[PDB]
């Protein structure tokens, strides 16, 4: 299938960068793969609208066309990012804000939303330093992207993989998680 990896981290030698490598090298050669590196793209995540350029025409904003096309093209999206303040780094938040717009990713129904991205699945891989025993007691941490962004847009299924206590654990332990990620990737 057609695979889009949306990767979010400022540092090319980060652990996230390593996670990206595991995914890229382990995806079968039968898939066609594009990597979207938001930091490398110098992506501008600030959504602009007003009376001059109306919110209604956001799906037609030129600067965002490339990204709309990458999303439409894809069958499966893989998101890689660290948890910053319980959620997506700002550049990735604004990727959603700006690219997942009405009349593209969804449209408004009599009540609620009608998702337009049917036929697509996703995988979320996220790192954070919070212990797993604590996770039922915390808000978001990837649950927003999965349950309240991707799902309402008709993207299903959405697998969520959290790698927890990521800075407390050891290099050994981290490398076991990378191996887990590599194997999940092969099993797609």
Q: Does 59 bind a copy of itself (CB under 8 A)?
A: no
Which of ligand FAD, a copy of itself, none sits in contact with 15, Cβ below 5 to 8 A by type? ligand FAD
CA dist 163 and 28 (Å) reads 23
> Which residue in the set 174, 182, 184, 188 belongs to the binding site for ligand FAD (CB under 6 A)?
174
Binding span for ligand FAD by CB under 6 A among 8-16, 33-41, 63-71, 114-122: 8-16
Whether residue 157 is preceded by a cis peptide bond, meaning omega within 30 degrees of 0, is: yes
Q: Based on the shown chain and the rule CB under 6 A, indicate whether residue 24 belongs to the binding site for ligand FAD.
A: no
d(Cα 68, Cα 63) in Å, to the nearest integer?
Answer: 10
Q: How many residues does the chain have?
A: 188
Quote the tokens at residue 96: 């959603």
Regarding 84 and contact with ligand FAD (CB under 6 A), the answer is yes
> How many chain residues interact with ligand FAD (CB under 6 A)?
23
Contact between 185 and ligand FAD by CB under 6 A: the answer reads: no
Binding at 30: pick from a copy of itself, ligand FAD, none (beta carbon under 5-8 Å per type): none
Is residue 129 annotated as involved in ligand binding? yes
**10 is in the binding site of which of ligand FAD, a copy of itself, none (Cβ under 5 to 8 A by kind)?**
a copy of itself
84 or 180: CB nearest a copy of itself? 84
**What is the helix (H) or strand (E) element at residue 9, kind and residue range?**
none
- Round to whole Å and give the CA distance between 28 and 187: 9
Measured between alpha carbons, how far is residue 174 from residues 16, 61, 98, 125, 153 in Å?
11, 41, 33, 14, 33
Region of residue 112 (left: phi > 0; alpha: psi -120 to 50; beta: else)? left
| Residue 166's binding partner out of ligand FAD, a copy of itself, none, with CB under 5 to 8 Å set by partner kind | ligand FAD
């Amino acid at each position: 299938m057609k695979i889009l990896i949306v990767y979010t981290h400022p540092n090319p030698t980060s652990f996230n960068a390593e996670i990206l490598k595991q995914v890229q090298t382990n995806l079968s050669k039968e898939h066609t793969v594009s990597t979207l590196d938001l930091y490398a793209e110098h992506f501008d995540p600030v959504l602009q609208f007003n009376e001059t350029h109306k919110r209604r025409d956001l799906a037609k904003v030129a600067e965002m066309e490339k990204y709309r096309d990458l999303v439409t093209w894809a069958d499966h999206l893989i998101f890689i990012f660290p948890i910053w303040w319980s959620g997506m780094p700002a550049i990735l938040k604004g990727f959603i804000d700006r690219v997942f717009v009405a009349d593209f990713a969804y449209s408004y129904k009599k009540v609620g939303l009608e998702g337009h991205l049917q036929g697509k699945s996703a995988w979320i891989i996220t790192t954070h330093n919070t212990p797993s025993f604590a996770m039922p007691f915390v808000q978001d941490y990837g649950k927003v992207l999965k349950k309240q962004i991707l799902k309402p847009c008709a993207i299903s299924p959405v697998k969520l993989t959290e790698l927890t206590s990521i800075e407390k654990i050891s290099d050994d332990e981290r490398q076991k998680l990378l191996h887990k990620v590599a194997q999940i990737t092969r099993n797609i």
